[PDB]
Amino acid sequence: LKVNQDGSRVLLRDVAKIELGGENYDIIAEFNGQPASGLGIKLATGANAL
Amino acid sequence: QLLAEAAKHPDMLTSVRPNGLEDTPQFKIDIDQEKAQALGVSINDINTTL
Numbered sequence: 001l002k003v004n005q006d007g008s009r010v011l012l013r014d015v016a017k018i019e020l021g022g023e024n025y026d027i028i029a030e031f032n033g034q035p036a037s038g039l040g041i042k043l044a045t046g047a048n049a050l
Numbered sequence: 051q052l053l054a055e056a057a058k059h060p061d062m063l064t065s066v067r068p069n070g071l072e073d074t075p076q077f078k079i080d081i082d083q084e085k086a087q088a089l090g091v092s093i094n095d096i097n098t099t100l
Contacts, residue, residue, distance in 0.1 A: 002087070003084065003088065009084070
């Protein structure tokens with residue numbers, strides 16, 4: 001991010017916690033108390049469900 | 051590996067081959083940001099020039 005006047009290095013891990021996480025934590029899912037996920041699938045007009 | 055194991059069954063297969071290109075040499079330019087900042091160079095200007 002910058003080099004201080006004292007010749008030091010200001011990395012990103014020194015001012016921020018970096019990790020992998022969902023783009024949004026709004027939605028969560030559980031299957032019988034068990035952590036899970038899934039897809040909700042709809043139909044396009046005119047198609048057959050089967 | 052699959053092409054190798056396929057050349058071992060010439061009684062059923064032949065002329066087996068890929069339909070693509072094989073890897074070629076590539077020139078990698080590793081930039082260092084410490085010096086680019088020390089000398090006061092904008093990585094944006096660097097890559098735009100390049």
